[PDB]
Design an enzyme around this catalytic site. Structure first.
Site, PDB file in Angstrom:
ATOM      1  N   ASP A   1     -11.894   0.581 -91.053  1.00 21.49           N
ATOM      2  CA  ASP A   1     -13.084   0.130 -90.432  1.00 21.49           C
ATOM      3  C   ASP A   1     -13.961   1.225 -89.920  1.00 21.49           C
ATOM      4  OD1 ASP A   1     -14.384  -1.442 -87.976  1.00 21.49           O
ATOM      5  OD2 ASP A   1     -12.791  -0.282 -87.092  1.00 21.49           O
TER       6      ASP A   1
ATOM      7  N   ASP B   1     -20.725  -1.721 -90.976  1.00 23.22           N
ATOM      8  CA  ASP B   1     -19.345  -1.939 -90.540  1.00 23.22           C
ATOM      9  C   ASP B   1     -18.291  -2.430 -91.530  1.00 23.22           C
ATOM     10  OD1 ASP B   1     -17.944  -3.995 -87.936  1.00 23.22           O
ATOM     11  OD2 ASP B   1     -17.912  -1.885 -87.901  1.00 23.22           O
TER      12      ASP B   1
HETATM   13  C1  LIG Z   1     -13.490   2.279 -80.964  1.00 21.78           C
HETATM   14  C2  LIG Z   1     -13.684   1.059 -79.996  1.00 21.78           C
HETATM   15  C3  LIG Z   1     -15.116   0.883 -79.522  1.00 21.78           C
HETATM   16  C4  LIG Z   1     -15.928   0.305 -80.627  1.00 21.78           C
HETATM   17  N1  LIG Z   1     -15.524  -1.058 -80.810  1.00 21.78           N
HETATM   18  C5  LIG Z   1     -16.351  -1.962 -81.311  1.00 21.78           C
HETATM   19  O1  LIG Z   1     -16.827  -2.786 -80.533  1.00 21.78           O
HETATM   20  C6  LIG Z   1     -16.598  -2.104 -82.795  1.00 21.78           C
HETATM   21  C7  LIG Z   1     -17.971  -2.669 -83.018  1.00 21.78           C
HETATM   22  C8  LIG Z   1     -15.556  -3.082 -83.227  1.00 21.78           C
HETATM   23  C9  LIG Z   1     -15.422  -3.520 -84.666  1.00 21.78           C
HETATM   24  O2  LIG Z   1     -15.386  -2.712 -85.827  1.00 21.78           O
HETATM   25  C10 LIG Z   1     -15.273  -4.913 -85.109  1.00 21.78           C
HETATM   26  N2  LIG Z   1     -16.445  -5.133 -85.924  1.00 21.78           N
HETATM   27  C11 LIG Z   1     -13.978  -5.158 -85.873  1.00 21.78           C
HETATM   28  C12 LIG Z   1     -12.641  -4.922 -85.235  1.00 21.78           C
HETATM   29  C13 LIG Z   1     -12.262  -3.487 -85.063  1.00 21.78           C
HETATM   30  C14 LIG Z   1     -11.660  -5.276 -86.257  1.00 21.78           C
HETATM   31  O3  LIG Z   1     -10.694  -6.075 -85.620  1.00 21.78           O
HETATM   32  C15 LIG Z   1     -10.921  -7.304 -85.695  1.00 21.78           C
HETATM   33  O4  LIG Z   1     -11.145  -7.915 -84.642  1.00 21.78           O
HETATM   34  C16 LIG Z   1     -10.887  -8.052 -86.888  1.00 21.78           C
HETATM   35  C17 LIG Z   1     -11.565  -7.884 -88.075  1.00 21.78           C
HETATM   36  N3  LIG Z   1     -11.204  -8.919 -88.790  1.00 21.78           N
HETATM   37  C18 LIG Z   1     -11.734  -9.264 -90.101  1.00 21.78           C
HETATM   38  C19 LIG Z   1     -11.874  -8.134 -91.110  1.00 21.78           C
HETATM   39  C20 LIG Z   1     -10.774  -7.462 -91.594  1.00 21.78           C
HETATM   40  C21 LIG Z   1     -10.930  -6.472 -92.562  1.00 21.78           C
HETATM   41  C22 LIG Z   1     -12.176  -6.136 -93.056  1.00 21.78           C
HETATM   42  C23 LIG Z   1     -13.278  -6.805 -92.570  1.00 21.78           C
HETATM   43  C24 LIG Z   1     -13.120  -7.796 -91.602  1.00 21.78           C
HETATM   44  C25 LIG Z   1     -10.289  -9.672 -88.117  1.00 21.78           C
HETATM   45  C26 LIG Z   1      -9.627 -10.827 -88.520  1.00 21.78           C
HETATM   46  C27 LIG Z   1      -8.759 -11.437 -87.628  1.00 21.78           C
HETATM   47  C28 LIG Z   1      -8.553 -10.906 -86.363  1.00 21.78           C
HETATM   48  C29 LIG Z   1      -9.202  -9.754 -85.950  1.00 21.78           C
HETATM   49  C30 LIG Z   1     -10.069  -9.150 -86.837  1.00 21.78           C
END
Ligand SMILES: CCCCNC(=O)[C@H](C)CC(O)[C@@H](N)C[C@H](C)COC(=O)c1cn(Cc2ccccc2)c2ccccc12
Length: 333
Positions: free
Chosen positions: A35, A219
């Site tokens: 990610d 993303d």
């Molecule tokens: C380094 C921490 C501070 C930055 N954190 C953030 O807020 C960023 C924006 C967070 C971010 O990348 C999110 N967009 C995704 C997050 C890391 C990934 O984790 C997830 O919550 C999930 C992401 N997916 C779906 C997914 C899985 C693989 C590829 C694409 C999408 C999930 C499915 C079921 C349950 C949890 C998740």
């Protein structure tokens, strides 16, 4: 230097794309999402109390079976947009398709069931920049690059439409078996974030939105395209979609009618027809097909921002370029 390696990824229903890393000697195989929104690496810890049912349903890292673990211990909490996990730091060697790198990671000790009871991946591998690493743990890509092994300091994403291979990451380059036409590079707006400037979303023929310049996180670890709850509501109002709590819906017969919506990312007019954004589970008069765009209020930190997730990367091969600090999109084959 010279070499490239690639991680094949499995595709789960166009919403979860996860590949596999091995941590430890012997290696312990983990499924992970690669990610670009986060920058830390974590995996469930054997130490997780199995009173957290996400832990009694996922692979856990057992450091007592690893010869090479070097204990560290500092607590860590990752607050992602959708949910949170906390745990501590450890170090062991992680193998990311061919390249092996010593890496500091998080063994998660606490893992909410919602949403992680529905995640097919066990961990997250952040491909972000050090500016976002909770606790300044040097992220696996700045680590791989220190090996001197790659040809190009870049990485590219192919996310397939599923049912063949599910997707592919290439470390060190980009693979032209998967994109046609040629790249369109947009520079990053500051370093630290895979973030770029966006100036206009247009539903059908005329710019309803972001007409004054918004941002877009690009993303790979997000299944949808998302905008803030205001920008999304007017988009949705316009399309005629309703909210069944976590998503917007449409009566399926309308789906193949919904206007092409277009993203005018710096330079070009990137544009999804209604195959691209609608899950056509059917074509009925009544039944409801979900749409692939979510409201998601990414927090002040980075910003409120539109996050261009896996609805967009599957239409356009994304090359993430660190040497020249820019992202480039070109069409998916
Ligand atoms: C380094 C921490 C501070 C930055 N954190 C953030 O807020 C960023 C924006 C967070 C971010 O990348 C999110 N967009 C995704 C997050 C890391 C990934 O984790 C997830 O919550 C999930 C992401 N997916 C779906 C997914 C899985 C693989 C590829 C694409 C999408 C999930 C499915 C079921 C349950 C949890 C998740």
């Amino acid at each position: 230097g010279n070499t490239t390696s690639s991680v094949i990824l499995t595709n789960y229903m166009d919403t979860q794309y996860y590949g596999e890393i091995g941590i430890g000697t012997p290696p312990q195989t983990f499924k992970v999402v690669f990610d670009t929104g986060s920058s830390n690496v974590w995996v469930p810890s054997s130490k997780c109390s199995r009173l957290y049912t996400a832990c009694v349903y996922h692979k856990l890292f057992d450091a007592s079976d690893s010869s090479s673990y070097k204990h560290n211990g500092t607590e860590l909490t990752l607050r992602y947009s959708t949910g949170t996990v906390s745990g501590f730091l450890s170090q062991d060697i992680i193998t990311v398709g061919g390249i092996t790198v010593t890496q500091m990671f998080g063994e998660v000790t606490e893992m909410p069931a919602l949403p992680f009871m529905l995640a097919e991946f066990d961990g997250v591998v952040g491909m972000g920049f050090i500016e976002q690493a909770i606790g300044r743990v040097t992220p696996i890509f700045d680590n791989i690059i220190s090996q001197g092994v790659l040809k190009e300091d870049v990485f590219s994403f192919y996310y397939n439409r599923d049912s063949s291979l599910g997707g592919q990451i290439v470390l060190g380059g980009s693979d032209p078996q998967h994109y046609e036409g040629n790249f369109h590079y947009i520079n990053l707006i500051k370093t630290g974030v895979w973030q770029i400037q966006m100036k206009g979303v247009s539903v059908g023929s005329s710019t309803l939105l972001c007409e004054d310049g918004c941002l877009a996180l690009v993303d790979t670890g997000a299944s949808y395209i998302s905008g803030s709850t205001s920008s999304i509501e007017k988009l949705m109002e316009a399309l005629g979609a309703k909210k069944r709590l976590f998503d917007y819906v449409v009566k399926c017969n309308e789906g193949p009618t919904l206007p092409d919506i277009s993203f005018h990312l710096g330079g070009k007019e990137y544009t999804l027809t209604s195959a691209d954004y609608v899950f056509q589970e059917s074509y009925s008069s009544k039944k409801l097909c979900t749409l692939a765009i979510h409201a998601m209020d990414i927090p002040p930190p980075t910003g409120p921002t539109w996050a261009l997730g896996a609805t967009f990367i599957r239409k356009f091969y994304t090359e993430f370029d660190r040497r020249n600090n820019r992202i480039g999109f070109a069409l998916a084959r």
